[PDB]
Amino acid sequence: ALTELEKALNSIIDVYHKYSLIKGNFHAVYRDDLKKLLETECPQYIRKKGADVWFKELDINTDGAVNFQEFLILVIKMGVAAHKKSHEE
Amino acid sequence: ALTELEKALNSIIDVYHKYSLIKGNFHAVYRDDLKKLLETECPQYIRKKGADVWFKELDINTDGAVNFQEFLILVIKMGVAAHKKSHEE
Ligand SMILES: [Ca+2]
Ligand SMILES: [Ca+2]
Ligand SMILES: [Ca+2]
Ligand SMILES: [Ca+2]
Ligand SMILES: [Zn+2]
Ligand SMILES: [Zn+2]
């Protein structure tokens, strides 16, 4: 990671691995793991949607866990909301 | 204090604005602007695809520019690709 964009994606990968390496499959963020991720990494306006609501949305293949590709849904939705709020009067 | 995940998204937003503030509509990355972004922010396996190939692919509504939502398509594909490459070699 040499550029700002590459470092940012590398940080996103490290954030995901910080919760997927807790237990179970190394590429699975479970419902309780996601709850800690939301409470630790995300702002209140993302956090207050609830871990259960987010998990239903993120678990695309309905295997009971959130993989990295599914995790990008939360990442992108956080990016849209943060950028939207940055210009919002 | 801002979390690692929040900083990463702010950096992504900063990257986009770095090129959308160049000229014209300040929420628009034009063809040459996107080429500068790809040539500066992105690795080789992204760049080799071609700047014009990326533009045609990212400019979904064919309005002549890449807005923020369209730019996130590149971020997603780069995120998946970077994660896959981080588990190589
Ligand atoms: Ca796990
Ligand atoms: Ca899943
Ligand atoms: Ca512009
Ligand atoms: Ca467009
Ligand atoms: Zn903006
Ligand atoms: Zn991984």
Author numbering:
A (entry chain D), B (entry chain A): 1 to 89
Quote the study on this structure.
As for all their congeners, S100A8 and S100A9 form homodimers as a minimal, active unit.
Although zinc can replace calcium in the EF-hand motifs when present alone, only Ca2+ was found in all EF-hands of our model as judged from the anomalous difference Fourier maps. In crystal form 1, helix H4 is not involved in crystal packing. The movement observed for helix H4 in both crystal forms is therefore more likely due to the presence of the Zn sites rather than to a different crystal packing as compared to Ca2+-hS100A8.
